[PDB]
Amino acid sequence: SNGRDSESKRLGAKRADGQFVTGGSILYRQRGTKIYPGTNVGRGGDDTLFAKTDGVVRFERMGRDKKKVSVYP
Amino acid sequence: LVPKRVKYRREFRGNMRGRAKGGTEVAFGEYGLQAVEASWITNRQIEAARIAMTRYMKRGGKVWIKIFPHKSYTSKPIGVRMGKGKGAPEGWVSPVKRGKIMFEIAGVPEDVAREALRLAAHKLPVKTKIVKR
Amino acid sequence: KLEITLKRSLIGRPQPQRKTVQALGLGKTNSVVVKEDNPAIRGMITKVSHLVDVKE
RNA sequence: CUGGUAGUUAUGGCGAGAAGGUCACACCCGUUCCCAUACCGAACACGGUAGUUAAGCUUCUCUGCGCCAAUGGUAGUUGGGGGCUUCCCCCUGCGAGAGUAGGUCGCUGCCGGG
RNA sequence: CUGGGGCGGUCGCCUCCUAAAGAGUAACGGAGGCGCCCAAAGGUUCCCUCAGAAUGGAUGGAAAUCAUUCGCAGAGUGUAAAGGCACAAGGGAGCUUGACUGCGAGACUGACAAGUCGAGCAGGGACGAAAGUCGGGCUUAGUGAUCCGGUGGUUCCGCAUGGAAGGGCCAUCGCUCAACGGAUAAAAGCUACCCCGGGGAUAACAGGCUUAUCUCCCCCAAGAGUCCACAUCGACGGGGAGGUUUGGCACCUCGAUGUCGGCUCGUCGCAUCCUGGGGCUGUAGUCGGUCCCAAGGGUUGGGCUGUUCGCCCAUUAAAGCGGCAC
RNA sequence: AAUAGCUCACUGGUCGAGUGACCCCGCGCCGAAAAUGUACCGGGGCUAAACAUAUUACCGAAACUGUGGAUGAACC
RNA sequence: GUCAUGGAGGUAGAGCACUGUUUGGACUAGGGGCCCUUCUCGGGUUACCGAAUUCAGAUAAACUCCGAAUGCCAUGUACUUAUACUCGGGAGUCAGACUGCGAGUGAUAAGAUCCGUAGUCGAAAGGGAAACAGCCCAGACCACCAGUUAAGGUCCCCAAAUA
RNA sequence: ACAAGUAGUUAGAGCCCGUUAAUGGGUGAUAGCGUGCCUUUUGUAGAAUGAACCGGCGAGUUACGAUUUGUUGCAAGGUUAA
Ligand SMILES: CCC[C@@H]1C[C@@H](C(=O)N[C@@H]([C@H]2O[C@H](SC)[C@H](O)[C@@H](O)[C@H]2O)[C@@H](C)O)N(C)C1
Ligand SMILES: [K+]
Ligand SMILES: [Mg+2]
């Protein structure tokens, strides 16, 4: 009666803290906001975080419990 | 001893590495039976050990069972090949790790405590030490 | 300045250890190499200490 | 000193106690007007200043709750070795969680009035 | 597909655990969902805060609707689960149709086919005073290629020429093709009458590994035994040995390792059936019980059934149990 | 049969130095029965030729080195 | 490859803040035994049950207030090393095995099965483990009646200690 | 003619020879080491397959296309078919 599972969706970080990215680079794939859109970062319809401009990726604490990812030129 | 209900009917066997994380110092009683090596203790063995203890004390003093058989185990019948999914739940066990105090007694003199506990130890599949608070 | 000598075989050793021995510049068993004593080199030696002997 | 508005993982919070006020800020008074209530001028909005620090606000005190937190030890574990192996032991490096000594009743801006 | 095959179950998609703190990761492993829904349950602007409990109160009950207090969320989020969400992503209300057209730097995922995200640009809008947000829905299922047909459009082609027929292009519809990368538009059985190619890649015999089960031996001792645990039994539980059972696995053998019972011939083990020696006895004697030593020899003939086994008749000192390809 | 017999909880004498519980660690013992033949150190055999801790010599490979030779690549 | 630096990620461990499982005590609303007028409405009764409440104590693959070692992604003006990538021509492979470690299935059986991870075999001769693909040591270009070592050894078979 | 043999190989006396003259030839007491070849396999000395022996015969070819590399001629050209 078991024997089922969905295809794995390859979630998680796609670029490293300190790595240079081009505009549109997906930074994080996620369900909901495990990580929040920081500065120069957008949240897509499926919660995907992407760089809005070229620059360097920085994963940062938001405050105590939450986390954000930013892109600094 | 059986859980009134369980979230999952089937459960990994697990492992028994390391010293018991809790219940290593005798807490409610004067004397305790301490597991020296690890083992699964079945509910049938806990009962056999309890009745042996309690009978010798002659409904005197108190007996705390400090282990509970939370974990189900399954078996396949004889004449059944491998596969076709996990077997039916057969029994209930408490994985006892080394250092875990399994039984505690109070309200009897040392001599009677120490005898009731050796009588219990002979029903358990694990090497035991008697320890006092 | 360190003198590093490969004393044990790489046969049967994991790739990380083999790759480190290669980066140290060691070839066959009893190969010797002379390296400047840095943290970088010290770190390599530590990963493969069981394979090599180190003098000064 | 106080009003506004920011930053900072609550060491900033909660709770308890005290003091303060025409300069603000409040409560407060009123519904004619703009504007309001799925009923209610409660709120929102507008017009006032008789009354009051009671509350909010501000300042001060405290460790009861929370929060922060070493050192040491221990668990675990990379690598290297041994065993009698449900598992356990030794060497090297890393090293928690809990507990604890301790810390905390914030700190740091810019603007307006005084 | 398959711990041989058949029978049963399963087949695509989503969520979780397995999964070893990136990603990925198997099993006829452990759990659940899907093949939709919503004209608002979408967009935007503004405003809001839930579960439960206590106390008080007409119908009114444990529980309806009021009121106060405490309440980080114990609620909710169309729907499984996980991850999120109280500046709400939860709850009201007003206006709306961005559930837009052309696209798209660049990324993710990935054998391919596909799948996913996307700032920004242009057109023309919705809401908002503006800032701005809006290319459906908190996120991740809700689907199916090509070929062929149908319908709508069309500054495309039109077989001498003008047309037309018919085609192309754009849009859209028609399949559990669900065995869900779909052999065809269109498909069930039997073979002991069988045949060929292969396989010890894979079953039936025996060997091997394993020993759950099985046989034997122990530990503890509640008890039974008038009394008395241990003469003899020994519950509840615990530990082994053996490799004769029922099994598990699929390692040798499918260019053949003949498979049950019997006959003939035995040989070996000892966990001993008899005979020999001995301890204990709940051993008066005669008989026994139980344990220890002991494998030298011995260990029946019939009735029934293919039987092994078993029951029976009649004996015997005794009518042993096992291994040797049962 | 009960009474007594013996033997004694309890002693002063001897005779006189140790004696009795309990816990931990090392190494052993029993528990220990299978089928052709010893048959659960490869054998002999071993009381160390076993075990523990420490030490040093030596043996031991087609490893590495020495001598000669052949050969690929890269470089000059 | 290492060093340094930054980061994502919830395993081991641990913990009980949530969810499930769970022991003992205290408390306490009900219900159920027991008589009473009684409608057992409520008393006087209670270890016959029982939901919260706390105090102490356990427990978890599908619990988490926490949380390593490693591994992973990246940066460097660090030190070593020698490959990467692209485009073409030609393949073979799609039965794997055991060992160690981490899991599932199984009985915490299997030389079982199925993944992950490393190694060896496969395709690897040599030495050791009596013999013994997969264990220990170690990689055979050829010749030598030279040498030094590895695992394993040194009384005899049998080279070396009756150290 | 006291020996336990995948038949050799390494060491090696003794005996017998005398060459394409070489640190030669035949034989081999004794000693060490040593499980054919092929196929098929995770793994075969295999108690898996095939071959009694010897000899002969016995399996990637050609044509026409495609593509790629090498070579040669000519080159913004090159080349002819029947
Ligand atoms: C349950 C049986 C298991 C199998 C039996 C065996 C086999 O095939 N036997 C053959 C035999 O046939 C003849 S005997 C009449 C032949 O002479 C004899 O050699 C042999 O081939 C036949 C009886 O089927 N297999 C190897 C395994
Ligand atoms: K025991
Ligand atoms: Mg998967």
Ligand SMILES: [Mg+2]
């Ligand atoms: Mg969407």
Ligand SMILES: [Mg+2]
């Ligand atoms: Mg090794």
Ligand SMILES: [Mg+2]
């Ligand atoms: Mg099978």
Ligand SMILES: [Mg+2]
């Ligand atoms: Mg089957």
Ligand SMILES: [Mg+2]
């Ligand atoms: Mg992962």
Ligand SMILES: [Mg+2]
């Ligand atoms: Mg058409």
Ligand SMILES: [Mg+2]
């Ligand atoms: Mg025409």
Ligand SMILES: [Mg+2]
């Ligand atoms: Mg398919």
Ligand SMILES: [Mg+2]
């Ligand atoms: Mg017939």
Ligand SMILES: [Mg+2]
């Ligand atoms: Mg087979």
Ligand SMILES: [Mg+2]
């Ligand atoms: Mg069989």
Ligand SMILES: [Mg+2]
């Ligand atoms: Mg056989």
Ligand SMILES: [Mg+2]
């Ligand atoms: Mg297999």
Ligand SMILES: [Mg+2]
């Ligand atoms: Mg044959």
Ligand SMILES: [Mg+2]
């Ligand atoms: Mg006997």
Ligand SMILES: [Mg+2]
């Ligand atoms: Mg008959």
